[PDB]
Enzyme design. Structure first.
Site, short mmCIF file in Angstrom:
data_model
loop_
_atom_site.label_atom_id
_atom_site.label_comp_id
_atom_site.label_asym_id
_atom_site.label_seq_id
_atom_site.Cartn_x
_atom_site.Cartn_y
_atom_site.Cartn_z
N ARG A 150 1.41 -1.20 -0.22
CA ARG A 150 0.23 -0.21 0.13
C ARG A 150 0.22 1.54 -0.12
O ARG A 150 0.42 2.36 -0.21
CB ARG A 150 -1.01 0.13 1.62
CG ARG A 150 -0.31 -0.07 2.97
CD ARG A 150 -0.71 0.43 3.84
NE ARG A 150 -0.29 0.97 4.73
CZ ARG A 150 0.53 -0.67 5.46
NH1 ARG A 150 0.37 -1.62 5.04
NH2 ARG A 150 1.68 -0.46 7.03
N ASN A 151 2.01 0.85 0.53
CA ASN A 151 2.87 2.34 0.63
C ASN A 151 4.47 2.20 -0.99
O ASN A 151 5.43 3.09 -0.92
CB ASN A 151 3.73 1.96 1.78
CG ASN A 151 2.71 2.61 2.83
OD1 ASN A 151 3.79 2.94 4.12
ND2 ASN A 151 1.85 3.45 2.78
N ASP A 164 5.67 6.75 1.33
CA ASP A 164 4.67 6.58 2.22
C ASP A 164 6.26 7.07 3.50
O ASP A 164 5.85 6.02 4.19
CB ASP A 164 3.95 6.02 2.46
CG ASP A 164 3.19 6.81 3.70
OD1 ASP A 164 3.03 6.65 4.43
OD2 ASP A 164 2.48 6.27 3.36
#
Ligand code: ACP
Ligand code: ACP
Lengths: 284, 286
Positions: A150-151, A164
């Site tokens: 997700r990062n 991130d």
């Protein structure tokens, strides 16, 4: 409130905020048009991403956004790391301008391409790119601490970008053995020492990379499926480790297992992962 | 986690359902708890369950445990979301609380805005009155909420206002006065100046927040300090700035909001005084 850094400062009057890209932990991201952000093209409007505080932002959120910006300054440029383009920090809200990745985070990218489906080679490539990104990061004495699909963002050219940096730190800017250290790292991607010994090193990021690899070959699967966060570390101590993914090769799985070695120094370095991955990719 | 039999609830008696929404440090899902109401031991009561998210951090866990413990000490009150039970042994932590079918007050109000079931003026005063009572009770229990806001208020099927989200609440004595880190996690636009400037927190800090909540209520869910970025807010506050009067309220109710936003904490009304004035305004309106 915020010290001047002319080299990174961008004029507020040349930025035009657009549609939001998503609300996050300590911030918000919106699409935007930045004129002349590329100093070789003073009149060109470049589509960028802007990170700012949410309306319900806390003092700590601001501290985190500031810290994230500072980390991105000290990291530099690399093909596989989202890049900082500038910031509006003087008299006005804080805007951190970074490059825009048109295809979203890796987890979403992969889950949407589950049987343009992803080929085995594609998966090895994504992995290789991210390994290369982490090798560079490590050489910059930077620990990410929040590595996960997700990062990772993917550009229009399908280039992998480590993103991130809200929890990122300089290897020497960690408060060892303090009860509160590593307390904000997602548990299922965290190295065991991060909690049991309250330390964090490049070898800790290597453990996370292992989890990332598993996410990649499961095409965005959720780590430790069916196992609650509350009982993970007990199982980890006992030796539990996720099983091998189907689209995965025995060799690549052995690499994941090496990354999940209990002893930090027994895990491979990012330098070695790049080498093995380059070899495997070339063969593929 | 220590054992607390009186609050413990059988995992096999709980059935998780559709999620209601992921949050800061947790996740809330609807569920059926059979026999939670020991009056009807075989009755399946609809409830709300808060648990960790799959990407939870260590801090999230201690924050949920803390919210649970806080709710245990507060007690039972009409205008405060009530803790019903909890699964804390052998398995994931489930905090089972009273279910509020109409969601948070912000969403509730914005969904009732005039097309230009609409909210009447009295409904707005009633809403405010109910929350004042909840806070008055909370303060008498030596508890400071610290995160008062429309989004942190739940509304039941019958429109009873329920103060919720005790993730940041603390006993009056569990706060480190003067420490640079204190109050660092409170939403700035709802926070009293002393919380940041002096690093202290009292019931009077909560009434400042109550004032902002009042403003959210009369603007039917508007965002406080529109057009003003959080990083610039405190400079403006020190300079005297205060939100303008919402179109839907009287000068009297606006004066109340303003009083809540006094720079001097002791010059702000107490929750008891707020209750009495709101009770009077509500009654005379009827
Ligand atoms: N540079 C960028 N280009 C494109 N999308 C981006 C981006 N940076 C962030 N995003 C998107 O915006 C979303 C929300 O922001 P953020 O990354 O702060 O959230 P979070 O990681 O706390 C959860 C991300 O999940 C991602 O999909
Ligand atoms: N008891 C309850 N009954 C009904 N809905 C509830 C509820 N508790 C929470 N919710 C809903 O779930 C959402 C998410 O939960 P939470 O309050 O943890 O988020 P947060 O970001 O405030 C922290 C809330 O905004 C609300 O809509």
């Amino acid at each position: 409130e915020l010290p001047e850094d002319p080299k990174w400062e961008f004029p507020r009057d040349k930025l035009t905020l657009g549609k939001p890209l998503g609300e996050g932990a300590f911030g918000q991201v919106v699409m935007a048009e930045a004129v002349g952000i590329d100093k070789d093209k003073p009149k060109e409007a470049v589509t960028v991403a802007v990170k700012m505080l949410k309306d319900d932002a806390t003092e700590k959120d601001l501290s985190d956004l500031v810290s994230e910006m500072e980390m991105m300054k000290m990291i530099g440029k690399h093909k596989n790391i989202i890049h900082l383009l500038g910031a509006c920090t003087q008299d006005g809200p804080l805007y951190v301008i970074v490059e825009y990745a048109s295809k979203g985070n890796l987890r979403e990218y992969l889950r949407a391409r589950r049987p343009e489906q992803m080929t085995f080679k594609d998966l090895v490539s994504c992995t290789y790119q991210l390994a290369r990104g982490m090798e560079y990061l490590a050489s910059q004495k930077c620990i990410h601490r929040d590595l996960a699909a997700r990062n990772v963002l993917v550009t229009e050219n399908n280039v992998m970008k480590i993103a991130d940096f809200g929890l990122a730190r300089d290897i020497n800017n960690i408060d060892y053995y303090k009860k509160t250290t590593n307390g904000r790292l997602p548990v299922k991607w965290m190295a065991p020492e991060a909690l049991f010994d309250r330390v964090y090193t490049h070898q800790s990021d290597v453990w996370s990379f292992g989890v990332l690899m598993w996410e990649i070959f499961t095409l965005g699967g959720s780590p430790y499926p069916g196992i609650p966060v509350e009982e993970l570390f007990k199982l980890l101590k006992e030796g539990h480790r996720m099983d091998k993914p189907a689209n995965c090769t025995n060799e690549l799985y052995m690499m994941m297992r090496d990354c999940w070695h209990a002893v930090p120094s027994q895990r491979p370095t990012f330098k070695q992962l790049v080498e093995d991955l380059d070899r495997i990719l070339t063969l593929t």
